[PDB]
């Protein structure tokens, strides 16, 4: 709440339970390789509920 961002992107997608642990900078799997790959120098947050 004390930071200013030039722009903010909210990527939304429903995925399975293990694939939550999958989504992270520098990971592997059928989702992190062919479906959604977070860049290595990621600056942001992931939210899974």
Token pair, residue 17, equals 């339970």
Place of tokens 């939550």: 20
Is residue 39 a contact point for other proteins (CB under 8 A)? no
From 7-15, 27-35, 39-47, give the range in contact with other proteins by CB under 8 A: 27-35
**29 and 22 in contact (C-beta within 8 Å)?**
yes
Is residue 30 a contact point for other proteins (CB under 8 A)? yes
| For other proteins, the closer CB: 16 or 43 | 16
Single out the residue of 9, 8, 15, 12 nearest to residue 32, CA to CA. Answer: 15
Is residue 29 a contact point for other proteins (CB under 8 A)? yes
Q: Residues interacting with other proteins, by CB under 8 A?
A: 28-30
């Amino acid at each position: 709440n004390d930071l200013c961002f030039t722009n903010v992107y909210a990527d939304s997608f429903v995925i399975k339970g293990n694939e939550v642990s999958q989504i992270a900078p520098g990971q592997t799997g059928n989702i992190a390789d062919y479906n959604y790959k977070l860049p290595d120098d990621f600056t942001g947050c992931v939210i899974a509920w």
